[PDB]
Design a protein around this ligand. Sequence first.
Ligand code: NAP
Ligand code: NAP
Ligand code: NAP
Ligand code: NAP
Ligand code: 1CY
Ligand code: 1CY
Ligand code: 1CY
Lengths: 249, 247, 249, 248
Amino acid sequence: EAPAAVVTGAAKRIGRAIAVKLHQTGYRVVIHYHNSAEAAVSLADELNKERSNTAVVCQADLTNSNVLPASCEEIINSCFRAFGRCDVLVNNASAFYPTPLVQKTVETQVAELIGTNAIAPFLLTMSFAQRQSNLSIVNLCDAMVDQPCMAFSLYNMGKHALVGLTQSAALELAPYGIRVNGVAPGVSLLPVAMGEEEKDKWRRKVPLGRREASAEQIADAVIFLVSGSAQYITGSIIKVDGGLSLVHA
Amino acid sequence: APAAVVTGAAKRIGRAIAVKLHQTGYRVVIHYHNSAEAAVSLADELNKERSNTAVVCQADLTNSNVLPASCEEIINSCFRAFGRCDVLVNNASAFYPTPLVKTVETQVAELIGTNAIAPFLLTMSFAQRQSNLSIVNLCDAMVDQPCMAFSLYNMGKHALVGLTQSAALELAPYGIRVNGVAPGVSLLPVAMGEEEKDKWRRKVPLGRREASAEQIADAVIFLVSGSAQYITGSIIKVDGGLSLVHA
Amino acid sequence: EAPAAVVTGAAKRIGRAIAVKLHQTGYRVVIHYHNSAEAAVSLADELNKERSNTAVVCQADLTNSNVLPASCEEIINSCFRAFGRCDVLVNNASAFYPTPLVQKTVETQVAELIGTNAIAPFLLTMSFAQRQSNLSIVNLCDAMVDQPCMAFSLYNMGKHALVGLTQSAALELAPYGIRVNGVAPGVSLLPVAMGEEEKDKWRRKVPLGRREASAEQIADAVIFLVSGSAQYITGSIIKVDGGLSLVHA
Amino acid sequence: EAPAAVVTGAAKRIGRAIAVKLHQTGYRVVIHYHNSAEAAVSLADELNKERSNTAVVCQADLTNSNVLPASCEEIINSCFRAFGRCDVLVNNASAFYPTPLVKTVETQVAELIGTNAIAPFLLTMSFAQRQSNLSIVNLCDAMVDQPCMAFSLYNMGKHALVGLTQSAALELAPYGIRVNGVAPGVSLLPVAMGEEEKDKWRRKVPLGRREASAEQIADAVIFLVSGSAQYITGSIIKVDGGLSLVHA
Ligand SMILES: NC(=O)c1ccc[n+]([C@@H]2O[C@H](COP(=O)([O-])OP(=O)(O)OC[C@H]3O[C@@H](n4cnc5c(N)ncnc54)[C@H](OP(=O)(O)O)[C@@H]3O)[C@@H](O)[C@H]2O)c1
Ligand SMILES: NC(=O)c1ccc[n+]([C@@H]2O[C@H](COP(=O)([O-])OP(=O)(O)OC[C@H]3O[C@@H](n4cnc5c(N)ncnc54)[C@H](OP(=O)(O)O)[C@@H]3O)[C@@H](O)[C@H]2O)c1
Ligand SMILES: NC(=O)c1ccc[n+]([C@@H]2O[C@H](COP(=O)([O-])OP(=O)(O)OC[C@H]3O[C@@H](n4cnc5c(N)ncnc54)[C@H](OP(=O)(O)O)[C@@H]3O)[C@@H](O)[C@H]2O)c1
Ligand SMILES: NC(=O)c1ccc[n+]([C@@H]2O[C@H](COP(=O)([O-])OP(=O)(O)OC[C@H]3O[C@@H](n4cnc5c(N)ncnc54)[C@H](OP(=O)(O)O)[C@@H]3O)[C@@H](O)[C@H]2O)c1
Ligand SMILES: CC1(C)N=C(N)N=C(N)N1c1ccc(Cl)cc1
Ligand SMILES: CC1(C)N=C(N)N=C(N)N1c1ccc(Cl)cc1
Ligand SMILES: CC1(C)N=C(N)N=C(N)N1c1ccc(Cl)cc1
């Protein structure tokens, strides 16, 4: 009776807020994680305290490799194993770090940045569709893909490829009743490693409130796109950026 | 309760928007141009649900020397009736072909005046008269793959995307968010024949579902809600995937 | 015979550079102007000294009004009266000034900023098509239309509408063999009234050389689009912005 | 004195036209190829008959793998070894075939994302590291936002190439390297395709109801590498006869 969702990178930050808000809406959740085992299990424990048997964890590395298709098939399979269905996929996990063009091996950088941001979403989409209502996939995009950060070529390529996937999968999966959309943050929760001065630099750029989005504000757009209020929406990407992408240099 | 202005609210998409805002708890101004009977019938229905929660406002939104005063009056009607104006929905729109190969300047006044200049003037008036404030502009998901011989209409819809972006930036400091909803094929022109309507329906990837005014209104309701408090300068397509479909 | 071109706002600045470059390519030109009669006649004199009977002037206000259609018809007629043909239309004339949303009448600002930037290009395009080899129209667009200057709503609306005209006219006129394209500068010749301090702030934003485009660099892109090297190009807008539109806030 | 350029997938079709027009403009050329050795050598012999010692060939698979970075470094090095300089890189090579959501999938990923995006990335890195008018031109696709059904990996690769074009234009602009794209709509159609199917495509094109020639695509590439485009970076020129403007 209750629908079920997979959220990638759901242990912390935006993915956690998405998983929590889906669970609040009535979903059973698969909390995917890679390194954040403690936080994953903690979250599943909390959700299960709320409604028993409504949350599981699933560990996987989403770096590209010849075994990534099996890892992605396993994530989707974990949903069916736990809940007997899989109604929603949220592709949220993402590696992010600079890859300067002018001077980990570069092949590892490609595997991680293109794998987590683009290839794992594609394979997760394949596995979701093959295993199949209000079914839908939501991809976490980037509102700044056309005004990218200096020296983040590979990350930017991965996020552009994720827009292409959102469009192509929305076209191809529409006859199966699967809607595919994206949510594109601008600045939301800033990197843990970032200093306060640098954080404030980014905050001051945002027209609407001179502040970053909360994780919950991003989650609210995901909730809309999976909801019955979005059943004619497919192939759309909703920027949640407080106006940041409108701001010239 | 908060209050909303919906332009072109007597029929079709704008009526669906007005109904859903009302259902969410807003008081509404139902703007109309030629559709007085329909506007009053809707206000009658809404007032039966909650009395003195819906009023009507007549105005022609063709561009002219008097359009700024007309737009000011629409916003003023909200403040008079309700003491505030939280939401502006720019939905009124003229649509018809203007082949390159009514005088042309009347077509300009109507196509560019209703789809762009009236939204601009209403935005200025709404901002000047100022919570969760926001404006939602009814855009068009096919602005970059336009209908043949619809130059002026397409120019007006592009101008409305520019207004969306420019107004979002400039009003962000006032806490006013400005967003768009871009339908694809929704309620077809009543005029349009049935064979041509079916031809369109067949091209929609999600076309197993019918397009409805309610679906458009649902996107409007999200963007005015507290669930969209960080969203400004965004246009949400509601087109069933149609804009993805190559020739 | 030599082909002929109309260039709007061609007395000074970018429009003059486009006229000169088309003239040096072998075109006969109509130099449209509004207020700059001395500069317009002076340019026509210089071009006619290089090749006799190859340049005329044509005066017109391109503000929107009930007479603008006739003014636009007359510009195109001027080209056919002087030269017997009209192969190229360059829509360069443009008004630009702030129109703040929160505080000339506003209806005047609308007439000027939407008239010169969008309605007069539409009417000129209608007249050019109706009066009809390598025929094309080039619209001077703006590379920063999606990252606009604060308080320039009406200017921005008119430049967006010009993108819409570029696309719509390309689609509709393709069957008649008329191509319609745009050139979108970032920062090129800065306003004459701008102080050097302010000019430098803009220059410093430009990735490629930290300087504005020369008028000739903009004209080079126009010359390509009218040439036989662009014979399959229609509905395209070429940014000529040194990377400015890629730079985040 | 003469500048030099690397063109990937240069033995046939669009890449061959680009190589010829660059040579005609006065460049020395590296003709990269993967499987089309006879055609690559035929072109290099033609070009060298026109002007001695102006064309070489370089073979490489541009599928993604652990050796792809070395391969791409070797292609750029081939230009420096042959000509002493490398002024232009044209990322033209491309795999294209359907990958329906409903060869192993990881081979399809390596091929479609490697040739269309990762090789251009690695070649761009190699080009920039090794450095009058330097530029890179990436062959994009005007239909990236209205994609052919069941081509998700190809479309993801071409979108990633738009991101590379923008990100590389921004990062390389301080070194005076410009990075731009040319996005065909329908140009030379696949060799297998029957005329009836080719005509279905041709009839969709507003401007002339025909596909672009390879030379038409090449002309946009020649503009972007020229002195006439010295302020243009991060731009992608659609060469598509209006095709992308046509609704369903
Ligand atoms: N935060 C923003 O300002 C912002 C801006 C633009 C776009 N976004 C997008 O929104 C989504 C959420 O952002 P966020 O800041 O919450 O992300 P985040 O904290 O940087 O990362 C999300 C999760 O990704 C997982 N991840 C990283 N590498 C992985 C790998 N190799 N295999 C599997 N999982 C891996 C990590 O899981 P473990 O912790 O379990 O290792 C991580 O917690 C991301 O897609 C991001 O690109 C965010
Ligand atoms: N498939 C679709 O329906 C579709 C597709 C794309 C975009 N849209 C956009 O969505 C919005 C609503 O669509 P719709 O089909 O419901 O619109 P519509 O029925 O065609 O027109 C809505 C209202 O516009 C008002 N209007 C027309 N000319 C006017 C003028 N000179 N002054 C004042 N009002 C005027 C009319 O009000 P009166 O009846 O009171 O005179 C009309 O009822 C429009 O902005 C439209 O462009 C709709
Ligand atoms: N310059 C830049 O950095 C830049 C950046 C982005 C876009 N652009 C676009 O590129 C084009 C050329 O730029 P620019 O700086 O050379 O333009 P500009 O000097 O600001 O204006 C060009 C001409 O427009 C004509 N004009 C102004 N109002 C008019 C009216 N009411 N009726 C008829 N003509 C009118 C004027 O002719 P008279 O002098 O004869 O009165 C003026 O010389 C414009 O479309 C502009 O928007 C330029
Ligand atoms: N033709 C069109 O209509 C059209 C439309 C849109 C975009 N484009 C783009 O324009 C470019 C030229 O198009 P085209 O039709 O001439 O291309 P094409 O003939 O399909 O392919 C170009 C060359 O790509 C090379 N290539 C394929 N797989 C490779 C691999 N694993 N490693 C190295 N090289 C490989 C091949 O070289 P070998 O022959 O030596 O093996 C092939 O000759 C492509 O980027 C394409 O995506 C073309
Ligand atoms: C690093 C972080 C948080 N994480 C991912 N996965 N993607 C981003 N875009 N991020 C991000 C990077 C820089 C800034 Cl300023 C904001 C968010
Ligand atoms: C004022 C000027 C020169 N002129 C027009 N018609 N359009 C612009 N965009 N301009 C412009 C405005 C600001 C800057 Cl910074 C550069 C050019
Ligand atoms: C196969 C071909 C020629 N080759 C590549 N590398 N890319 C494309 N986009 N192509 C293409 C595919 C279909 C059509 Cl209709 C036209 C060109």
